[PDB]
Structures are given as structure tokens and as C-alpha cells.
Symmetry: C2
Subunit: 120 residues, 2 copies
């Protein structure tokens, strides 16, 4: 079980690199991007968000770790959506990029903290 | 164990640092304006067991940066193609794969 969970965390790192390349690609090509980027609830559509929504009965020890990564994942997707809307509508600012980078680093931090807990 | 934990910390820092690098590239294009590579050189003389792992991540890191540079030059000069983005994504995934394989070796 522990090795199963850890595999899914490492897949989330690769999948979110590809998500970011996809956003950069769609601005340069002037595309309509994809639901995983633009949907108001895009965090439900990627592989990681689906794993999260179906976990099931969690015990009291692991709960706080899972709640933190769920919340940080959602916030990262929300900042991504807002960045893309601002770029497309010609109202972007440096602050949109800073907020997105911070959201991104909070997500990787939340994943790492759960990793450490499981390994002990 | 202390040495092993030191190495593993440096590998997780590389993941965050290369996310920030990808954000900066995206930002500079829209505005129309590294630590890991220094660490690879500073590993000192290596034994024969670890050598192949280190050589693979060094090579994959270099090719990722080269694809990034070529993507940016093509965008700026207006002859970019979908293939430039695909080559960069593939370089990026080869790098993270090489890091993971070294991680697994150290843990055993
Ligand atoms: Zn996601
Ligand atoms: Zn680098």
C-alpha cells in the first residue's frame, strides 16, 4: 500500500510539468487550451484530483496531510486558470505569474510532507 | 545515511528549481523581455557502481537545457513549430526519469 501511494505522488510531478508546458504552448499557438487548464473546477479532471476524490475512509493520523495536499492542489489550478484568462484578455500583471509560482511550490511542499510521514 | 540524505535533498530541490525555470521562460515570452549543474560537477571522484547513474542524469540535464534554448530562439525569431515543444517536453521527462532511477539505487 505504501509503495502504491508513493508511485502516485511521483506521477503527479511529471503530469503537472506537462500541464505547464501545455499552458505555455496554448498561449504561443493562440489555442483554446483544454478543460484541465480552463474549467472552473479543473482540479477534478486531472489524474491526481481523481485519485484524491476517491480515497475513502481516512484515519485521524493521515487526515491532516491529505487535507493539505487537496487544498494546495485546488489553489494551484485556480491560480493557473486566472493567469490564462488575464493573458488572453490582455490584463495580465507580474503578480499573476508570482501567485502561480507560489501556488505551485506549496503543492510540491504538501506532497513532500506526506511522503516523509509515510516513510516513517 | 547522512551522505545519502544529503544527496536526496539536492534531488528534490532540482524539481522545484526547474519548475521556476519553466515559469520564467513562459513569463519572458509573454512580457517580450543553474544550482543542479554546479552540484553535478562537485560530486568529486566517483566509484564504478554509481558512475552510470551520474552520467545519465548529467547527459539528460544538458539535453533538457539545450532543447529549452532552441525553443526560445525559435519563438523569438518566429519560426517555432509544435515539434520544438514536443522535443522540450520529452527532454524534461527524460531528466526526471534519470533522477528517479538514481533515487531508487541509493535507497537500496
Ligand atoms: Zn492537477
Ligand atoms: Zn538545470
Amino acid at each position: 500500500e505504501i509503495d502504491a501511494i508513493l508511485l502516485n505522488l511521483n506521477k503527479a510531478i511529471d503530469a503537472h510539468y506537462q500541464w505547464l508546458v501545455s499552458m505555455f504552448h496554448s498561449v504561443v499557438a493562440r489555442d483554446a487550451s483544454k478543460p484541465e487548464i480552463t474549467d472552473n473546477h479543473s482540479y477534478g479532471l486531472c489524474q491526481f484530483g481523481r485519485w484524491i476524490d476517491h480515497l475513502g475512509p481516512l484515519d485521524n493520523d493521515e487526515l491532516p496531510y491529505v487535507r493539505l495536499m487537496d487544498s494546495a492542489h485546488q489553489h494551484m489550478h485556480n491560480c493557473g486558470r486566472e493567469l490564462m484568462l488575464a493573458i488572453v484578455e490582455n490584463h495580465w500583471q507580474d503578480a499573476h505569474f508570482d501567485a502561480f509560482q507560489e501556488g505551485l511550490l506549496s503543492f510540491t511542499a504538501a506532497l513532500t510532507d506526506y511522503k516523509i510521514y509515510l516513510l516513517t
